Design an enzyme around this catalytic site. Sequence first.
Site, PDB file in Angstrom:
ATOM      1  N   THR D   1      46.169  39.212  36.545  1.00 30.44           N
ATOM      2  CA  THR D   1      45.606  40.395  37.665  1.00 30.44           C
ATOM      3  C   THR D   1      46.781  40.921  38.597  1.00 30.44           C
ATOM      4  O   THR D   1      47.436  40.277  39.061  1.00 30.44           O
ATOM      5  CB  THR D   1      44.581  39.457  38.638  1.00 30.44           C
ATOM      6  OG1 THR D   1      43.478  39.371  37.973  1.00 30.44           O
ATOM      7  CG2 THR D   1      44.281  40.457  39.835  1.00 30.44           C
ATOM      8  N   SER D   2      46.561  42.419  38.756  1.00 30.81           N
ATOM      9  CA  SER D   2      47.519  42.962  39.560  1.00 30.81           C
ATOM     10  C   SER D   2      46.542  43.506  40.718  1.00 30.81           C
ATOM     11  O   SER D   2      45.913  44.649  40.477  1.00 30.81           O
ATOM     12  CB  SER D   2      48.273  43.976  38.991  1.00 30.81           C
ATOM     13  OG  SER D   2      49.088  43.399  37.790  1.00 30.81           O
ATOM     14  N   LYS D  33      37.546  44.592  40.575  1.00 31.31           N
ATOM     15  CA  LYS D  33      38.107  43.665  41.485  1.00 31.31           C
ATOM     16  C   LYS D  33      38.127  44.065  42.962  1.00 31.31           C
ATOM     17  O   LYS D  33      38.705  43.463  43.756  1.00 31.31           O
ATOM     18  CB  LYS D  33      39.803  43.498  40.854  1.00 31.31           C
ATOM     19  CG  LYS D  33      39.603  42.839  39.614  1.00 31.31           C
ATOM     20  CD  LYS D  33      40.966  42.549  38.992  1.00 31.31           C
ATOM     21  CE  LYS D  33      40.941  42.139  37.762  1.00 31.31           C
ATOM     22  NZ  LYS D  33      42.328  41.687  37.186  1.00 31.31           N
ATOM     23  N   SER D 129      49.077  37.728  39.395  1.00 32.43           N
ATOM     24  CA  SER D 129      50.181  37.255  38.580  1.00 32.43           C
ATOM     25  C   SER D 129      51.085  38.519  38.364  1.00 32.43           C
ATOM     26  O   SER D 129      52.377  38.277  38.184  1.00 32.43           O
ATOM     27  CB  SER D 129      49.576  36.849  37.406  1.00 32.43           C
ATOM     28  OG  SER D 129      48.581  37.609  36.791  1.00 32.43           O
TER      29      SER D 129
END
Lengths: 195, 195, 125, 196, 196, 204, 233, 226, 222, 212
Positions: D1-2, D33, D129
């Site tokens: 995930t960014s 998200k 991450s």
Amino acid sequence: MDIILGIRVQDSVILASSKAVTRGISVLKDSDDKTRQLSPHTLMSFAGEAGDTVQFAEYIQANIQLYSIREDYELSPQAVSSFVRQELAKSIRSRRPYQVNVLIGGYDKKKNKPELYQIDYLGTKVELPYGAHGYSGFYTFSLLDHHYRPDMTTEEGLDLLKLCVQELEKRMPMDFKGVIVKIVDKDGIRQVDDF
Amino acid sequence: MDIILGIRVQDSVILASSKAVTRGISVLKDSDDKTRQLSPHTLMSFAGEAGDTVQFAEYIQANIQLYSIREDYELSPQAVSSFVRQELAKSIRSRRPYQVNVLIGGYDKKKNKPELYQIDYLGTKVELPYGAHGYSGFYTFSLLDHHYRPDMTTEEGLDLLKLCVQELEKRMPMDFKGVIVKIVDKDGIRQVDDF
Amino acid sequence: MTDRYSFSLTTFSPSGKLGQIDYALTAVKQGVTSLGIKATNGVVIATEKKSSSPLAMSETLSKVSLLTPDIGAVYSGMGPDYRVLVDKSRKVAHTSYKRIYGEYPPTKLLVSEVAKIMQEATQSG
Amino acid sequence: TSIMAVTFKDGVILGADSRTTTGAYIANRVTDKLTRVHDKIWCCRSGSAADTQAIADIVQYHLELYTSQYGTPSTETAASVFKELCYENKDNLTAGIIVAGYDDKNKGEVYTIPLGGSVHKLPYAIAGSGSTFIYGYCDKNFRENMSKEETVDFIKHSLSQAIKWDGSSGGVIRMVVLTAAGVERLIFYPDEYEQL
Amino acid sequence: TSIMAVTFKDGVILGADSRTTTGAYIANRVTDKLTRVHDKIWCCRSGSAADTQAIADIVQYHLELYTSQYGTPSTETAASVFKELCYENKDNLTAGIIVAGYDDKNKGEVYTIPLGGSVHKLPYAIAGSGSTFIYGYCDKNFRENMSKEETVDFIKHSLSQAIKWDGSSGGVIRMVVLTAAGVERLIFYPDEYEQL
Amino acid sequence: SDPSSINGGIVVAMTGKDCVAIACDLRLGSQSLGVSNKFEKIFHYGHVFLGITGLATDVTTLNEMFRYKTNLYKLKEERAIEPETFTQLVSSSLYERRFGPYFVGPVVAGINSKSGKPFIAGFDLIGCIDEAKDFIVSGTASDQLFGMCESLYEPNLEPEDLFETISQALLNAADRDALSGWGAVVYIIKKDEVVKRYLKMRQD
Amino acid sequence: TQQPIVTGTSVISMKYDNGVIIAADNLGSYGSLLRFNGVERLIPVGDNTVVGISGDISDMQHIERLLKDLVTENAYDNPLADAEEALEPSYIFEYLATVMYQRRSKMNPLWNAIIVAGVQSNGDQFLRYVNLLGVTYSSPTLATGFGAHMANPLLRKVVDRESDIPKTTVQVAEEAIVNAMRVLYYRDARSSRNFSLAIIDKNTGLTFKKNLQVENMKWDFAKDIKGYGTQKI
Amino acid sequence: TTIVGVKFNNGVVIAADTRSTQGPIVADKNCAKLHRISPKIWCAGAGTAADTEAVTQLIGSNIELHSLYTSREPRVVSALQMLKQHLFKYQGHIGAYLIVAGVDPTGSHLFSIHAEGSTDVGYYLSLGSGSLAAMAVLESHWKQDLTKEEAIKLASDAIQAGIWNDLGSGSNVDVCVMEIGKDAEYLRNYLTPNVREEKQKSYKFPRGTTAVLKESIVNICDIQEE
Amino acid sequence: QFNPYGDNGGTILGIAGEDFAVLAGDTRNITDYSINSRYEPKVFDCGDNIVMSANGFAADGDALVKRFKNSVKWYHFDHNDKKLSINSAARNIQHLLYGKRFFPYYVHTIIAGLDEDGKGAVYSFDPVGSYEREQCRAGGAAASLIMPFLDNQVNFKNQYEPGTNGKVKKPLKYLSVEEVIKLVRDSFTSATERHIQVGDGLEILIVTKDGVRKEFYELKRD
Amino acid sequence: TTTLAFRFQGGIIVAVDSRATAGNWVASQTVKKVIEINPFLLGTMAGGAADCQFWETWLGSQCRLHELREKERISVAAASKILSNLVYQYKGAGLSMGTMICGYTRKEGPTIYYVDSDGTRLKGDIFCVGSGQTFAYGVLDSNYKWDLSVEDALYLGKRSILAAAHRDAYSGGSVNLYHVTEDGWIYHGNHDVGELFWKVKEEEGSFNNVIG
Ligand SMILES: [Mg+2]
Ligand SMILES: [Mg+2]
Ligand SMILES: [Mg+2]
Ligand SMILES: [Mg+2]
Ligand SMILES: [Mg+2]
Ligand SMILES: [Mg+2]
């Protein structure tokens, strides 16, 4: 195996060893002789891990018999016990150590003295008036501390030994199927066939 | 504790239970009675973890005695065994289960029949002609399978029981210090004081 | 706070009458007529939609209610009491039967459950 | 995930990738998200999807009930509710949430709530991450009071790099713009951002 | 640790921080992580200091003996010797080495040898714990055939950010320039690079 | 240690033409030790039959529990419970111990008294229903039973043919399992007669 | 015993009427970090064989050197090194399979999954698999890692059994392989867009294609997807 | 297990294989994995079979009561919210992995839900041990604006990929089609591509083959009158 | 930690007739829930009228078969092209297996052929080399499904003669090669239905005095 | 597993069951647990099947080499010790073995040695090894006499295995009987436990608990 006792009296050494051989669930034998004659006036009883006990005892026996033939001479009990200690002290730092505890009862023909040596699997040697291995001493030493005299006869030693075995039979959880008793004196080694 | 045996013959149930109480290293007692009278014609022997055995047995005894007084009536052996099974079946999923195995020997006065029930700590109940708990059955069942007859007298049952105990004393490693034997029949419960 | 009425509000009078039950039956007597008829191949239940006002949409007020796919109910008396009983009856058909047996309850047993709820309002604190 | 949120002159913009992985398998390549807890208070979620969804749903409920009683909540208030849930249940949660919102009084605000349940008010925030790979880039390129077009470019370039290096990140770049003018959704596809 | 090597028009430059940590204690704040294995073949070390020093010493020995017999070794040859030690002893080593060198025939070359003992020839390489934070920045800012001054600025800015975010990195930025002109050492202090 | 294989035992059920069959071994053991050769694992509540393998204390407990529940069912419903309904009751009852389950493998067999349709069903320890048309197996020799049933079974067998098929399925499966055997029982179930047969088999 | 450090993902392959196709992406991962973007994982041996390798890259580079050495060694004292006594796909595979099984038997494996694709002297298609355990198998389609789970189902729809091979052209086979590579890019988190593809044909020989990209990707539908359940905006 | 869900023009379709297993053993060869939450809200379950069934029936029961209470037809988002909040509470110990699809007054919907309580929106989804085989087919052939016939075809093809390639999946394809303004049509055993071939031999025994010790009539009747 | 072992599934079956022997095995190769190959031969002709299969971990299985084939070759070199009898092959395989007693071939081996009297022979091995001559033996994944069926249909276990009611056993009459093949096919068809690792194809090798013949049959591919 | 061997007036009786199990799964009912070391020596199988088979066949080879070199039959004492010394070398490596080495020579008479994988070597009159050993001991101990006839001794060994086969879940299949004389062992047949049980039940009146 289980119980091995020793007592040095005036003129002899008496070794008592249990007869039971238990493999986990069942008692496979009730007449096992946990001893080897190393020389005419030296007897060794033994207890520890299965297989290793007899393997070690017979290995020692072979070595002492070899010495006896080479020199035409019987090693003193002290000399034999020192040889045995070194073998066990060597063994404890091996890849797979001998898990064997021994008592060496011998009559020294030079000094005209009985001698009892207690040696554990680490190579810890002590000369004693009476000795044991495992839990045997926990039940018997208080009786031996009380009654033992250095001037005891062989018959008195056997009577004190009977009292020790009776106490073992009373308070020990395991059934060791009685003991084989052997006497070591100036005339050699003999077995008491009624005990 | 250790060995508990049961045998249902023609007109009675015989329960044999060892006398030894061992706390690890020492045998603390050699005359322990591992049984409780639940009602005049119902006897329960027991073996398992220390403390829990007697606690459970006395708890059951109290409950059956309470029922006997309330109804002025003795519950059948079958009814008592079902009550006991439920208590153990309840216990096995408790915070700390009773680690207790029991034999229930009773004489049903209505049917005029002896009855033997074997129940383990999980609440596993079976009615049997003869039964045991622990390792006792491993040594004795081959003898019972051979000699047992449903029409045996009490005296023949005791003789077969002696043969079972003799085999246990021969092949078992532990010294269980003999057995207390009790007979349950139409006249109630009595102890065989010489065995 | 706390419900400190932990005692019965319905009690036996000297004559043996349970007053509150009799008075509840009186409230039923004042209620609009409803009826039921059983045929060989069906049952019919019916009532009047007594509209409280002509501005009120009487279709939004259901006097006849589905309890299960094969069970229906109608009433006479206090409408709000009926509405909550229908909610409880629908739920109890699931909790005490369908979630156990995987099928809807038979008419007599659902009736029994509704009856039990009404009995308890006659004895509970 | 960014994930990231960046304040700018006219308000704040939230940015995120769309990749959700179970080990090395991409369970969803078009995940959203960017989650709405109020009209102009949104959040970016990272960590356990079950946890961050459960938390967000509870917050949305809390702010809905707040609004009914006390009117529109501040972004600070929303962040406080997030923090209360994350801090008090820290033993049973794996959630890293960035809260972004637009007031008229306070304008654009960004709050980050990392694993422990602490709160940090920042001009911009990065998480997930993939964020590890763009700390250098973001620090060098962020300016205060950027325009809408500059901020979109900053987020687009930042998440492009995060996606490039992080296997756990990928798919489309989603963005939500929060200003006085309203709420605008943006999407940017691989063929666009990969050539940057 | 933050280490990098960058090829440019006139050759190659190696860069490194100077921080060596034992847990959170800085055991040495002025470490020299740029190591000479031959006149114009140097390396950057990361991982176990004991391992990377042992490896470097053996390589220097190998290249010294190579030179006595066969003349100046190539940078590829040096990288191969590093790889041989790292790959064959992978079970007992924790070493991440970047090899950089200048030939006249091949000019500036950079080889990276990560944990496994694989070799990768690259235009530039980054390694160490601090490198994670500058993947985005370095990828965006690296150009081929930069000047000496541009490459020094690129490394200075890159390691500045790595130091900023990584607690394991810090102190001075050391650099070694490898060209036809010779070998030049550079050093940059905190007061210089922190304000970038 | 594994609760489902301490006591041992097996159950198998099959459908035939206007009939069902359910069968079980008679062994109860404590691991290697044989304890009882009369431990029947098939019970019945009215015309519905229930076989239960697994931990013997739970077998006994569940039998008592379903006797309890079907007795109350009958008093309230004023009719005997049907196989389809009872299957749902077993499933419900097992799942309510989801995180502390009975270690059992129940098997339901019976004929619906109104439709006359043969019915069988199986469950895992936690309540998941397996409603097979052909056969259901359970116990420590379930693999062996699957092998026997898959080859021996054919649809629409007459009651006396079905008896031979299910008997041979049980017997040969049990003889390849250390913890099963010591006798066997077979129930042949028709709409209004049930025949119970004890089989002769090796006692090792 | 070790653990893989720098790794390569799926290798996929299939047979067609006149030969074999094999493909693998150009990524060298470092855990979840997509570290190296120019790694060639298809290694040709002569003009009749291509060895595709997944798993540990350091071990791949070692295997690459073994194969290079194998070609050198075969040429020694061999006048027919470029003719009758050239290396066959079957020779190359059996050698690797021996090495893989020996290494696992010393408890020190080469941490790889390998597919050897080629065409034999007599024109027969060769396609066989070997991994770190020394396990070997052949099939009309072969794939490693994720490819085994996602590529094989797609490739098996083209060649489902042996009799489908003569009915499958190189155009249909390549199309299937390229589509599978796109699907893996959608769904494998350790994959890249860039890949290599090799065709070994009994008529046209070895065609090695570098710098291929996954194209014709569907992403537009993502714009309509909002929230995770109840969200409308 | 292989389960899929596919959105189309005017609704949604879900499909599933029919194999249930205990380890490597096939317990049931024709298992029903398509569960009904409400008349027009159906779901397919993977993971622990008892959990997928139990959680469906519980939410389905509460959905029915909710529908009666509100005088409205149930919504998929309600089933979704109730499922996820239940599953989240139990922290994944209830091993239910579901694809939830349906039509309601709001429109047609397709969601997935993982056992720990996380949910997902999509036009095509798959779950189970054969989900990777199914998703490969879906990713290769899915497009926007599918017709009913195309979606049924795509869904069943995705299940087939699981049946043939995943050992955890097999036997038959079950399908349920939920179209807007129509009754949901449950197509049990829509495809049957795995019928067992005739055996080489009949294993019907001669009567009297089995040795019998005792016979007796079992009294299944109640206590009799007179 | 590195696990040197794996499970490739598969099921094999050896049956000894009066003057013949069959060794059958499915052609499916698997890991976990994936199919590696639908046709990967598992039963091999090893020369000297001996057929062999080493089922379990396929790498160890291939290694063992390869080493035994090699042992047959060197037996001919060392002993004047003497035919390796099935009993001699069996003893030889024990030593191959026991040679790795402390790092075993993770396989269940079966060989089939004819003994020196021309009668059918099947030998069965455990992973470390204990072996026995047997009439009937299934090995691998679905062995527990097949063996009880064979006890019943080959050895007529639990079958008695009608009318006697348990007093007279069904006599053990000899089966033809056509009869055995029927039982093999039905064993694998049943195993395919109930075991996920069994399927795709069935390959049977039949050994007679005339030599080794092969038969192939399709199995369900799900 | 259940194996026994006992010394008596007429030599040695060796009796074993035939069952092998892998967990609850009965792998075989036709296992041979008496290893025919040579025409004069027998060994029993318990613990590890391969370990017993392999090393007792090997023992046969060593016994053959002994008598070729010494021109004399090997003693039971010497034969048993070759095996016990061998397994003692491997102690710790994980060999599993519990065997009775049985023989009848001129100098020794009938002799039985219990040899075991942890190095134990015991001479004795009655030995019983396996999961069902306790059951067989019961029948043996209560019925054993030195002056048993060959016929009665054979039956006693058969009956003791049956007792174990019945109660012990991991024992059964069939009973193999051997009689060891000075001139060599004599095989006394394979006896299916299923058929034997019913036969013994009827003729003996035992197993009244079981319905037949
Ligand atoms: Mg959690
Ligand atoms: Mg080191
Ligand atoms: Mg720092
Ligand atoms: Mg059995
Ligand atoms: Mg499949
Ligand atoms: Mg048995």
